[PDB]
RNA sequence: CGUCGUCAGCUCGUGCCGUGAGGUGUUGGGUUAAGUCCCGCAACGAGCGCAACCCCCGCCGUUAGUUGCCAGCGGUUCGG
């Protein structure tokens, strides 16, 4: 909540090409063939975005974090592994929201196989199944790791790159689910309800924004949590 | 019942795409006898198939000696 001057590395955008003209309002200028985000409008939108986040958090709402850019995977896997908001990390399966019932059936199979490997029924029905179901539970935990926490449809979603995760954005629009997103120059701002005009490539921007967001979430529900152990993931 | 044909296929549920017939899934890369499996993917699963569970032939054991053997000894019209 004090990220005014500590925003080191967020103003960096993508190149001159691969941009979206609809983002021109959130751009300050172009330095050395690279779009640089407007520093003022960044916090201008951050006010309203974080205010919506606090309102939805203190009401007890669930937010789905979505990240697949391979630069925010290890960060989302723990910033959402804090206060119990679910997440999707490896890839966004088509129909996680519109076909939410079938994916919940997949989650049922996940916890069923978890109950099988907890019961003494592991050894019966010989080793063929002990390998098949082992690999099946492996991949189910690989994909539905954070998604298993959703019992109903989420009240909002959080996206790291709305261009790379455009399918989740589209499904959220279809179901009238608010779309919080960390938008860059390559993204369409109209599809994002609450926009965060920052960098989606640099690890520091993602760590800063997501850490402060989860800190605001836990601050809305009381019991301020220690700083997130995602700094060591700078590497 | 024969046949394409023991051929590797044909579909469905939900979601998504298209005004619509339809598509996606079932395409792709690797692999297999196989839509067999792996990886990827607006798809996620499922059914009839494939395969397996059935029978026979292959090695061994347990249970049982009106089939078998000087394996073992005795008798032998010396033919278990
Ligand atoms: K058209
Ligand atoms: K193939
Ligand atoms: Mg065959
Ligand atoms: Mg269909
Ligand atoms: Mg057409
Ligand atoms: Mg239609
Ligand atoms: Mg169809
Ligand atoms: Mg087809
Ligand atoms: Mg096709
Ligand atoms: Mg099959
Ligand atoms: Mg596929
Ligand atoms: Mg007899
Ligand atoms: Mg006998």
**What is the residue range of A32's domain?**
5-92+149-235
Q: Are residues A64 and A81 in the same domain?
A: yes
Q: Please report, for the domain that includes residue A137, its CATH number.
A: 1.10.287.610
Report the largest interatomic distance among the alpha carbons of chain A, rounded to a whole angstrom: 67
Contacts of residue A16, Cβ cutoff 8 Å, sequence gap at least 6: A30, A33, A34, A35
Does residue A165 share a domain with residue A71?
A: yes
Å from the A119 CA to the B62 C1': 33
CA→C1' distance for A222 and B25 (Å): 46
Residue A22 shares a structural domain with residue A12: yes
Q: CATH no. for residue A170?
A: 3.40.50.10490
The closest of A189, A130, A155 to A59, measured between CA atoms, is: A155
Does one domain contain both A29 and A73? Answer: yes
- From the CA of A22, how far away is ligand 5's center (Å)? 29
How large is the C-alpha radius of gyration of chain A? 19
Estimate in Å the CA A162 to C1' B1 gap, whole number: 62
Strand B bases within 7 angstroms of protein beta carbons: 13-17, 38-45
- What is the experimental method? X-ray
Answer yes or no: do A138 and A195 share one domain.
no
Residues 6+ apart with CB under 8 A from A172: A97, A157, A178, A179
Give resolution in angstroms. Answer: 3.3
How far apart, in whole angstroms, are the C-alpha atoms of residue A188 and residue A206?
19
Q: A100 with A115, same domain?
A: yes
Same domain, A136 and A159: no
> Separation of A170 CA from ligand 5 center, angstroms?
21
How would you class A80 by CB atoms within 10 Å of its CB: exposed for 0-12, middle for 13-18, buried for 19 or more? buried
| Closest nucleotide relative to residue A102's CA, C1' based | B44
Total residues found in chain A within this entry: 235
Report yes or no: A86 and A146 within 8 Å, Cβ to Cβ: yes
Place of tokens 């076909």: A99
Between the CA of A167 and the centroid of ligand 5 the distance, in Å, is: 21
Rama region for A9: left / alpha / beta (φ>0; ψ in -120 to 50; rest): left
Quick one: A45 and A160 in the same domain? yes
Q: Are A156 and A180 in contact (CB under 8 A)?
A: yes
Whether A155 and A74 map to the same domain: the answer is: yes
Two tokens at A170?
Answer: 């589209």
Helix (H) or strand (E) holding A29: strand A27-31
How many other CB atoms are found less than 10 A from the CB of residue A50? 22
How many separate domains does chain A show? 2
Task: Report how far residue A45's alpha carbon sits from residue A11's, in angstroms, rounded to the nearest whole number.
Answer: 14
Q: How far apart are CA A233 and CA A170, in angstroms?
A: 31
């Amino acid at each position: 909540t004090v990220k005014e001057l500590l925003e080191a590395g967020v103003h960096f955008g993508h190149e001159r090409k691969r941009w979206n003209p609809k983002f021109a309002r959130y751009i300050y200028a172009e330095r050395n063939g690279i779009h640089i985000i407007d520093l003022q409008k960044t916090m201008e939108e951050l006010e309203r975005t974080f205010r919506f986040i606090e309102d939805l958090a203190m009401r007890g709402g669930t937010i789905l974090f979505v990240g697949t850019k391979k630069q925010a995977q290890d960060i989302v896997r723990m910033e959402a592994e804090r206060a119990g908001m679910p997440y999707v990390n490896q890839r966004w399966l088509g129909g996680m929201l519109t076909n939410f019932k079938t994916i919940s059936q997949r989650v049922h199979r996940l916890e069923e196989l978890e109950a099988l490997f907890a019961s003494p029924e592991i050894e019966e029905r010989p080793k063929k199944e002990q390998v098949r179901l082992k690999h099946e539970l492996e991949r189910l935990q690989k994909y539905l790791s954070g998604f298993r926490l959703l019992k109903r449809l989420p009240d909002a979603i959080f996206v790291v790159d709305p261009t790379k995760e455009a399918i989740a954005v589209r499904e959220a629009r279809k179901l009238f689910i608010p779309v919080i997103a960390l938008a860059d120059t390559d993204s369409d701002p109209d599809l994002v309800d609450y926009i965060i005009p920052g960098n989606d490539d640099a690890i520091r921007s993602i760590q800063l924004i997501l850490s402060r967001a989860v800190d605001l979430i836990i601050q809305a529900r009381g019991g301020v949590v220690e700083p997130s152990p995602s700094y060591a993931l700078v590497q």
